[PDB]
Amino acid sequence: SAMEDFVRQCFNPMIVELAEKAMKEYGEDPKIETNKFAAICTHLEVCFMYSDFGHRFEIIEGRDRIMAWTVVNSICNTTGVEKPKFLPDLYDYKENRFIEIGVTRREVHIYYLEKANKIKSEKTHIHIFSFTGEEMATKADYTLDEESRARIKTRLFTIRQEMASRSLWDSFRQSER
Ligand SMILES: [Mn+2]
Numbered sequence: 001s002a003m004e005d006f007v008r009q010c011f012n013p014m015i016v017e018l019a020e021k022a023m024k025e026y027g028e029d030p031k032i033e034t035n036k037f038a039a040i041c042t043h044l045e046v047c048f049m050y051s052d053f054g055h056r057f058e059i060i061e062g063r064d065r066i067m068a069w070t071v072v073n074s075i076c077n078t079t080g081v082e083k084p085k086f087l088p089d090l091y092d093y094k095e096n097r098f099i100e101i102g103v104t105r106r107e108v109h110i111y112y113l114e115k116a117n118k119i120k121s122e123k124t125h126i127h128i129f130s131f132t133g134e135e136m137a138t139k140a141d142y143t144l145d146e147e148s149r150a151r152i153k154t155r156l157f158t159i160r161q162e163m164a165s166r167s168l169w170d171s172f173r174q175s176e177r
């Protein structure tokens with residue numbers, strides 16, 4: 001598929017490898033679930049950019065479940081912050097709170113409501129990004145400075161435009177995988 005080629009050309013090999021590992025966890029094949037492949041790569045890249053724009057942030061996404069829960073447990077033991085139900089994406093040492101990052105091809109408020117209804121934890125901060133430069137965060141607290149968020153928005157829009165140039169955007173956005 002052209003989607004796999006695009007993924008291997010636009011994403012660095014480490015992100016592609018982690019995404020393939022996550023698909024093995026899912027028991028899914030990157031050559032069949034190509035849109036899920038692109039979405040997982042995009043979410044990983046956004047989480048890594050978010051963490052690098054700070055060390056203010058502890059990365060939880062991208063680790064295997066053992067190490068992710070080990071990191072979450074150590075953070076909870078040191079800070080006393082409540083342990084989340086689901087594995088979040090980041091921990092913010094400055095605000096002392098876990099962060100769930102969302103990347104959606106739909107409207108940001110719809111996805112925000114979906115994520116907030118899932119996580120059921122007022123403590124965990126939510127930050128949603130779209131491929132159109134829109135964002136939505138808990139209490140309108142965007143955590144990052146405007147420059148870092150602009151970098152993330154530019155990266156997402158560029159991914160959307162590369163997909164559209166390769167005639168892949170319609171399939172990707174119409175899919176919720
Ligand atoms: Mn995650």
Ligand SMILES: [Mn+2]
Pocket residue numbers: 043089100101102103
């Ligand atoms: Mn996430």
